[PDB]
mmCIF file of N, CA and C in Angstrom:
data_model
loop_
_atom_site.group_PDB
_atom_site.id
_atom_site.type_symbol
_atom_site.label_atom_id
_atom_site.label_comp_id
_atom_site.label_asym_id
_atom_site.label_seq_id
_atom_site.Cartn_x
_atom_site.Cartn_y
_atom_site.Cartn_z
ATOM 1 N N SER L 1 -68.753 12.368 42.285
ATOM 2 C CA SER L 1 -67.532 13.126 42.542
ATOM 3 C C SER L 1 -67.701 14.571 42.084
ATOM 4 N N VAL L 2 -67.718 15.503 43.037
ATOM 5 C CA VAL L 2 -68.013 16.900 42.722
ATOM 6 C C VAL L 2 -66.854 17.556 41.984
ATOM 7 N N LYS L 3 -67.179 18.190 40.860
ATOM 8 C CA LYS L 3 -66.220 18.987 40.101
ATOM 9 C C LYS L 3 -66.834 20.339 39.780
ATOM 10 N N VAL L 4 -66.064 21.395 40.015
ATOM 11 C CA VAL L 4 -66.577 22.742 39.875
ATOM 12 C C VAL L 4 -65.612 23.579 39.054
ATOM 13 N N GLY L 5 -66.142 24.610 38.403
ATOM 14 C CA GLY L 5 -65.315 25.533 37.652
ATOM 15 C C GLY L 5 -65.754 25.721 36.212
ATOM 16 N N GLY L 6 -64.788 26.049 35.362
ATOM 17 C CA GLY L 6 -65.054 26.436 33.988
ATOM 18 C C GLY L 6 -64.048 27.491 33.575
ATOM 19 N N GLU L 7 -64.506 28.735 33.472
ATOM 20 C CA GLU L 7 -63.627 29.860 33.130
ATOM 21 C C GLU L 7 -62.938 30.453 34.346
ATOM 22 N N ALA L 8 -61.651 30.762 34.211
ATOM 23 C CA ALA L 8 -60.960 31.528 35.253
ATOM 24 C C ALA L 8 -61.493 32.949 35.195
ATOM 25 N N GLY L 9 -61.488 33.627 36.333
ATOM 26 C CA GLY L 9 -61.991 34.987 36.426
ATOM 27 C C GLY L 9 -63.108 35.105 37.450
ATOM 28 N N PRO L 10 -64.260 34.471 37.174
ATOM 29 C CA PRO L 10 -65.397 34.499 38.104
ATOM 30 C C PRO L 10 -65.108 33.765 39.400
ATOM 31 N N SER L 11 -65.909 34.030 40.419
ATOM 32 C CA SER L 11 -65.811 33.262 41.645
ATOM 33 C C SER L 11 -66.252 31.837 41.365
ATOM 34 N N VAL L 12 -65.793 30.911 42.199
ATOM 35 C CA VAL L 12 -66.314 29.552 42.159
ATOM 36 C C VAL L 12 -66.592 29.137 43.597
ATOM 37 N N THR L 13 -67.632 28.337 43.793
ATOM 38 C CA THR L 13 -67.982 27.880 45.128
ATOM 39 C C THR L 13 -67.869 26.373 45.190
ATOM 40 N N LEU L 14 -67.147 25.881 46.190
ATOM 41 C CA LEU L 14 -66.986 24.452 46.358
ATOM 42 C C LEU L 14 -67.934 24.031 47.467
ATOM 43 N N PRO L 15 -68.937 23.212 47.135
ATOM 44 C CA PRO L 15 -69.955 22.945 48.161
ATOM 45 C C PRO L 15 -69.511 21.949 49.224
ATOM 46 N N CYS L 16 -69.933 22.210 50.449
ATOM 47 C CA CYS L 16 -69.683 21.285 51.529
ATOM 48 C C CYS L 16 -70.706 21.519 52.636
ATOM 49 N N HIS L 17 -71.674 20.610 52.717
ATOM 50 C CA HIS L 17 -72.728 20.645 53.732
ATOM 51 C C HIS L 17 -72.670 19.339 54.501
ATOM 52 N N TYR L 18 -72.274 19.396 55.770
ATOM 53 C CA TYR L 18 -71.995 18.177 56.520
ATOM 54 C C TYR L 18 -73.082 17.780 57.514
ATOM 55 N N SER L 19 -72.904 16.595 58.097
ATOM 56 C CA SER L 19 -73.872 16.021 59.030
ATOM 57 C C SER L 19 -73.234 15.822 60.395
ATOM 58 N N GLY L 20 -74.041 15.409 61.366
ATOM 59 C CA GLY L 20 -73.586 15.322 62.743
ATOM 60 C C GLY L 20 -73.610 16.680 63.430
ATOM 61 N N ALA L 21 -72.905 16.796 64.548
ATOM 62 C CA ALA L 21 -72.928 18.026 65.318
ATOM 63 C C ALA L 21 -72.148 19.128 64.608
ATOM 64 N N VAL L 22 -72.534 20.378 64.855
ATOM 65 C CA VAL L 22 -71.778 21.545 64.393
ATOM 66 C C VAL L 22 -70.374 21.496 64.986
ATOM 67 N N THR L 23 -69.345 21.619 64.150
ATOM 68 C CA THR L 23 -67.987 21.441 64.659
ATOM 69 C C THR L 23 -66.957 22.181 63.797
ATOM 70 N N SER L 24 -65.688 22.133 64.195
ATOM 71 C CA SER L 24 -64.631 22.834 63.458
ATOM 72 C C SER L 24 -64.229 22.072 62.204
ATOM 73 N N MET L 25 -63.636 22.780 61.248
ATOM 74 C CA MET L 25 -63.282 22.176 59.971
ATOM 75 C C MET L 25 -62.056 22.873 59.374
ATOM 76 N N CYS L 26 -61.475 22.258 58.349
ATOM 77 C CA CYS L 26 -60.448 22.920 57.553
ATOM 78 C C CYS L 26 -60.643 22.620 56.068
ATOM 79 N N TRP L 27 -60.282 23.590 55.227
ATOM 80 C CA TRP L 27 -60.212 23.391 53.789
ATOM 81 C C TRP L 27 -58.765 23.147 53.425
ATOM 82 N N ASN L 28 -58.532 22.089 52.658
ATOM 83 C CA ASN L 28 -57.194 21.758 52.201
ATOM 84 C C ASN L 28 -57.061 22.084 50.724
ATOM 85 N N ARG L 29 -55.960 22.733 50.353
ATOM 86 C CA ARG L 29 -55.692 22.932 48.941
ATOM 87 C C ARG L 29 -54.816 21.764 48.521
ATOM 88 N N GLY L 30 -55.426 20.682 48.057
ATOM 89 C CA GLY L 30 -54.691 19.465 47.755
ATOM 90 C C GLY L 30 -55.606 18.310 48.072
ATOM 91 N N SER L 31 -55.166 17.093 47.778
ATOM 92 C CA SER L 31 -55.998 15.917 48.020
ATOM 93 C C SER L 31 -56.255 15.769 49.511
ATOM 94 N N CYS L 32 -57.295 15.028 49.857
ATOM 95 C CA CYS L 32 -57.625 14.821 51.253
ATOM 96 C C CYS L 32 -56.472 14.116 51.956
ATOM 97 N N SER L 33 -56.047 14.694 53.072
ATOM 98 C CA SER L 33 -55.012 14.098 53.904
ATOM 99 C C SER L 33 -55.692 13.091 54.835
ATOM 100 N N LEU L 34 -54.920 12.167 55.391
ATOM 101 C CA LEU L 34 -55.498 11.166 56.275
ATOM 102 C C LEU L 34 -55.875 11.734 57.645
ATOM 103 N N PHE L 35 -55.075 12.652 58.171
ATOM 104 C CA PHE L 35 -55.296 13.068 59.552
ATOM 105 C C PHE L 35 -55.354 14.572 59.857
ATOM 106 N N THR L 36 -55.291 15.402 58.823
ATOM 107 C CA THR L 36 -55.457 16.846 58.986
ATOM 108 C C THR L 36 -55.623 17.486 57.605
ATOM 109 N N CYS L 37 -55.434 18.793 57.507
ATOM 110 C CA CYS L 37 -55.276 19.419 56.203
ATOM 111 C C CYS L 37 -53.804 19.795 56.067
ATOM 112 N N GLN L 38 -53.018 18.978 55.364
ATOM 113 C CA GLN L 38 -51.572 19.224 55.272
ATOM 114 C C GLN L 38 -51.227 20.551 54.589
ATOM 115 N N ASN L 39 -52.130 21.028 53.740
ATOM 116 C CA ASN L 39 -51.999 22.376 53.202
ATOM 117 C C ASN L 39 -53.280 23.153 53.449
ATOM 118 N N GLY L 40 -53.611 23.360 54.723
ATOM 119 C CA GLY L 40 -54.847 24.031 55.083
ATOM 120 C C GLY L 40 -54.874 25.473 54.616
ATOM 121 N N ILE L 41 -55.943 25.857 53.930
ATOM 122 C CA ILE L 41 -56.076 27.239 53.478
ATOM 123 C C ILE L 41 -57.161 27.992 54.234
ATOM 124 N N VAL L 42 -58.031 27.247 54.905
ATOM 125 C CA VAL L 42 -59.035 27.835 55.773
ATOM 126 C C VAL L 42 -59.193 26.963 57.016
ATOM 127 N N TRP L 43 -59.285 27.604 58.178
ATOM 128 C CA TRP L 43 -59.547 26.910 59.438
ATOM 129 C C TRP L 43 -60.673 27.601 60.188
ATOM 130 N N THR L 44 -61.601 26.810 60.718
ATOM 131 C CA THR L 44 -62.639 27.333 61.582
ATOM 132 C C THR L 44 -62.430 26.784 62.987
ATOM 133 N N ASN L 45 -62.878 27.543 63.969
ATOM 134 C CA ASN L 45 -62.908 27.068 65.340
ATOM 135 C C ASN L 45 -64.337 27.297 65.760
ATOM 136 N N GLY L 46 -65.098 26.218 65.870
ATOM 137 C CA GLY L 46 -66.533 26.351 65.996
ATOM 138 C C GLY L 46 -67.035 26.971 64.705
ATOM 139 N N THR L 47 -67.930 27.951 64.820
ATOM 140 C CA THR L 47 -68.605 28.540 63.668
ATOM 141 C C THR L 47 -67.958 29.813 63.130
ATOM 142 N N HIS L 48 -66.678 30.014 63.391
ATOM 143 C CA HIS L 48 -66.045 31.186 62.818
ATOM 144 C C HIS L 48 -64.637 30.890 62.317
ATOM 145 N N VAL L 49 -64.305 31.504 61.185
ATOM 146 C CA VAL L 49 -63.023 31.312 60.535
ATOM 147 C C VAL L 49 -61.916 31.992 61.328
ATOM 148 N N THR L 50 -60.921 31.213 61.730
ATOM 149 C CA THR L 50 -59.819 31.767 62.504
ATOM 150 C C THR L 50 -58.588 32.003 61.647
ATOM 151 N N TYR L 51 -58.483 31.265 60.545
ATOM 152 C CA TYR L 51 -57.406 31.462 59.576
ATOM 153 C C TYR L 51 -57.914 31.369 58.141
ATOM 154 N N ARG L 52 -57.416 32.258 57.285
ATOM 155 C CA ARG L 52 -57.554 32.064 55.838
ATOM 156 C C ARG L 52 -56.301 32.534 55.115
ATOM 157 N N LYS L 53 -55.837 31.726 54.168
ATOM 158 C CA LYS L 53 -54.545 31.954 53.541
ATOM 159 C C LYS L 53 -54.607 33.124 52.569
ATOM 160 N N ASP L 54 -55.763 33.254 51.930
ATOM 161 C CA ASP L 54 -55.990 34.241 50.889
ATOM 162 C C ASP L 54 -57.289 34.973 51.206
ATOM 163 N N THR L 55 -57.247 36.288 51.068
ATOM 164 C CA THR L 55 -58.429 37.114 51.210
ATOM 165 C C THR L 55 -59.501 36.726 50.177
ATOM 166 N N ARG L 56 -59.085 36.050 49.108
ATOM 167 C CA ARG L 56 -60.025 35.564 48.102
ATOM 168 C C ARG L 56 -60.883 34.415 48.599
ATOM 169 N N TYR L 57 -60.506 33.818 49.730
ATOM 170 C CA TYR L 57 -61.235 32.648 50.231
ATOM 171 C C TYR L 57 -62.292 33.098 51.223
ATOM 172 N N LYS L 58 -63.557 32.766 50.965
ATOM 173 C CA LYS L 58 -64.655 33.144 51.861
ATOM 174 C C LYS L 58 -65.564 31.964 52.173
ATOM 175 N N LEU L 59 -66.036 31.895 53.410
ATOM 176 C CA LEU L 59 -67.085 30.951 53.753
ATOM 177 C C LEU L 59 -68.355 31.764 53.922
ATOM 178 N N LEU L 60 -69.216 31.754 52.909
ATOM 179 C CA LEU L 60 -70.342 32.684 52.862
ATOM 180 C C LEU L 60 -71.647 32.083 53.355
ATOM 181 N N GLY L 61 -71.645 30.779 53.606
ATOM 182 C CA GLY L 61 -72.859 30.092 54.001
ATOM 183 C C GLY L 61 -73.087 30.199 55.492
ATOM 184 N N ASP L 62 -74.170 29.587 55.964
ATOM 185 C CA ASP L 62 -74.502 29.564 57.379
ATOM 186 C C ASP L 62 -73.716 28.466 58.089
ATOM 187 N N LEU L 63 -72.592 28.835 58.699
ATOM 188 C CA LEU L 63 -71.777 27.860 59.419
ATOM 189 C C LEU L 63 -72.527 27.274 60.610
ATOM 190 N N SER L 64 -73.460 28.034 61.174
ATOM 191 C CA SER L 64 -74.215 27.510 62.314
ATOM 192 C C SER L 64 -75.146 26.391 61.847
ATOM 193 N N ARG L 65 -75.449 26.379 60.552
ATOM 194 C CA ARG L 65 -76.227 25.295 59.980
ATOM 195 C C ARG L 65 -75.378 24.431 59.044
ATOM 196 N N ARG L 66 -74.094 24.301 59.381
ATOM 197 C CA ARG L 66 -73.230 23.285 58.773
ATOM 198 C C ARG L 66 -72.960 23.485 57.283
ATOM 199 N N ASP L 67 -73.055 24.729 56.820
ATOM 200 C CA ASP L 67 -72.650 25.055 55.447
ATOM 201 C C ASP L 67 -71.267 25.703 55.453
ATOM 202 N N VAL L 68 -70.249 24.903 55.169
ATOM 203 C CA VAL L 68 -68.883 25.409 55.146
ATOM 204 C C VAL L 68 -68.323 25.447 53.723
ATOM 205 N N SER L 69 -69.219 25.614 52.752
ATOM 206 C CA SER L 69 -68.840 25.710 51.353
ATOM 207 C C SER L 69 -67.843 26.852 51.209
ATOM 208 N N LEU L 70 -66.826 26.626 50.388
ATOM 209 C CA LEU L 70 -65.769 27.611 50.167
ATOM 210 C C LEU L 70 -65.988 28.320 48.846
ATOM 211 N N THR L 71 -66.009 29.647 48.889
ATOM 212 C CA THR L 71 -66.032 30.453 47.682
ATOM 213 C C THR L 71 -64.629 30.998 47.431
ATOM 214 N N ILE L 72 -64.123 30.823 46.213
ATOM 215 C CA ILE L 72 -62.851 31.407 45.844
ATOM 216 C C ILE L 72 -63.149 32.537 44.877
ATOM 217 N N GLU L 73 -62.901 33.765 45.303
ATOM 218 C CA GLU L 73 -63.151 34.923 44.459
ATOM 219 C C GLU L 73 -61.984 35.135 43.500
ATOM 220 N N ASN L 74 -62.239 35.842 42.404
ATOM 221 C CA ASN L 74 -61.169 36.261 41.503
ATOM 222 C C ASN L 74 -60.222 35.133 41.097
ATOM 223 N N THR L 75 -60.796 34.082 40.515
ATOM 224 C CA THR L 75 -60.064 32.851 40.249
ATOM 225 C C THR L 75 -59.055 33.007 39.111
ATOM 226 N N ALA L 76 -58.011 32.184 39.151
ATOM 227 C CA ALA L 76 -56.996 32.145 38.107
ATOM 228 C C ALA L 76 -56.794 30.688 37.724
ATOM 229 N N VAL L 77 -56.182 30.434 36.568
ATOM 230 C CA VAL L 77 -55.945 29.054 36.142
ATOM 231 C C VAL L 77 -55.262 28.249 37.244
ATOM 232 N N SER L 78 -54.311 28.889 37.923
ATOM 233 C CA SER L 78 -53.493 28.215 38.929
ATOM 234 C C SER L 78 -54.282 27.747 40.151
ATOM 235 N N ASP L 79 -55.523 28.215 40.291
ATOM 236 C CA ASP L 79 -56.407 27.741 41.373
ATOM 237 C C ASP L 79 -56.926 26.334 41.089
ATOM 238 N N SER L 80 -56.789 25.889 39.841
ATOM 239 C CA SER L 80 -57.208 24.534 39.494
ATOM 240 C C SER L 80 -56.452 23.546 40.367
ATOM 241 N N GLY L 81 -57.132 22.468 40.749
ATOM 242 C CA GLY L 81 -56.542 21.430 41.579
ATOM 243 C C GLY L 81 -57.604 20.705 42.376
ATOM 244 N N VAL L 82 -57.166 19.796 43.238
ATOM 245 C CA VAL L 82 -58.063 19.106 44.141
ATOM 246 C C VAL L 82 -58.072 19.843 45.472
ATOM 247 N N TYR L 83 -59.245 19.907 46.094
ATOM 248 C CA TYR L 83 -59.399 20.513 47.407
ATOM 249 C C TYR L 83 -60.130 19.525 48.285
ATOM 250 N N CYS L 84 -59.995 19.693 49.593
ATOM 251 C CA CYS L 84 -60.681 18.803 50.515
ATOM 252 C C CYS L 84 -61.360 19.581 51.640
ATOM 253 N N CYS L 85 -62.652 19.325 51.809
ATOM 254 C CA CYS L 85 -63.400 19.863 52.931
ATOM 255 C C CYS L 85 -63.306 18.827 54.036
ATOM 256 N N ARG L 86 -62.590 19.135 55.109
ATOM 257 C CA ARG L 86 -62.428 18.174 56.192
ATOM 258 C C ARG L 86 -63.113 18.670 57.461
ATOM 259 N N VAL L 87 -64.142 17.944 57.893
ATOM 260 C CA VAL L 87 -64.929 18.348 59.048
ATOM 261 C C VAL L 87 -64.603 17.451 60.231
ATOM 262 N N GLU L 88 -64.085 18.043 61.296
ATOM 263 C CA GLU L 88 -63.544 17.259 62.402
ATOM 264 C C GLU L 88 -64.457 17.184 63.623
ATOM 265 N N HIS L 89 -65.044 16.011 63.826
ATOM 266 C CA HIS L 89 -65.935 15.793 64.951
ATOM 267 C C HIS L 89 -65.124 15.156 66.065
ATOM 268 N N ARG L 90 -65.817 14.642 67.078
ATOM 269 C CA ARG L 90 -65.143 14.032 68.222
ATOM 270 C C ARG L 90 -64.781 12.580 67.948
ATOM 271 N N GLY L 91 -63.563 12.341 67.476
ATOM 272 C CA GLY L 91 -63.087 10.978 67.283
ATOM 273 C C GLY L 91 -63.307 10.448 65.882
ATOM 274 N N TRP L 92 -63.883 11.296 65.037
ATOM 275 C CA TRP L 92 -64.120 10.961 63.644
ATOM 276 C C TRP L 92 -64.230 12.223 62.797
ATOM 277 N N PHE L 93 -64.062 12.042 61.497
ATOM 278 C CA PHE L 93 -64.162 13.156 60.572
ATOM 279 C C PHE L 93 -64.935 12.728 59.345
ATOM 280 N N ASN L 94 -65.351 13.723 58.579
ATOM 281 C CA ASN L 94 -65.929 13.513 57.267
ATOM 282 C C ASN L 94 -65.100 14.344 56.322
ATOM 283 N N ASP L 95 -64.692 13.778 55.203
ATOM 284 C CA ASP L 95 -64.032 14.618 54.224
ATOM 285 C C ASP L 95 -64.665 14.476 52.854
ATOM 286 N N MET L 96 -64.594 15.548 52.074
ATOM 287 C CA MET L 96 -65.209 15.560 50.756
ATOM 288 C C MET L 96 -64.195 16.095 49.763
ATOM 289 N N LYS L 97 -63.873 15.283 48.761
ATOM 290 C CA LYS L 97 -62.943 15.681 47.720
ATOM 291 C C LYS L 97 -63.675 16.479 46.651
ATOM 292 N N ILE L 98 -63.109 17.609 46.258
ATOM 293 C CA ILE L 98 -63.732 18.436 45.232
ATOM 294 C C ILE L 98 -62.668 18.832 44.230
ATOM 295 N N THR L 99 -62.958 18.668 42.940
ATOM 296 C CA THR L 99 -62.017 19.064 41.896
ATOM 297 C C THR L 99 -62.397 20.423 41.309
ATOM 298 N N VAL L 100 -61.396 21.284 41.132
ATOM 299 C CA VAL L 100 -61.599 22.599 40.545
ATOM 300 C C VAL L 100 -60.805 22.679 39.253
ATOM 301 N N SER L 101 -61.480 23.055 38.173
ATOM 302 C CA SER L 101 -60.829 23.184 36.883
ATOM 303 C C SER L 101 -61.244 24.509 36.252
ATOM 304 N N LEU L 102 -60.238 25.332 35.953
ATOM 305 C CA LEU L 102 -60.424 26.698 35.486
ATOM 306 C C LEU L 102 -59.473 26.984 34.330
ATOM 307 N N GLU L 103 -60.010 27.441 33.210
ATOM 308 C CA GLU L 103 -59.177 27.692 32.040
ATOM 309 C C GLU L 103 -59.148 29.170 31.667
#
């Protein structure tokens, strides 16, 4: 079970490297939802981000090679919580729960 963080202030990166075909995804700020990201903070359409809730949220990896890891810049204690990387393929998805803890 992936857990990331430590001190508030620095950036933190939540890793997510998926399998299967290159496809669209969403980052959820909250536990993994069953059928979408109920509190989606990042959305991709193919290999490019079409929505991000906060300018602090960046996908810095190679999306064409299935790296949709989320970097949260300028972190604060309140960023602590569970997040979900949800990758949506044709008729199935993969999701990865990640815990963030920042003091």
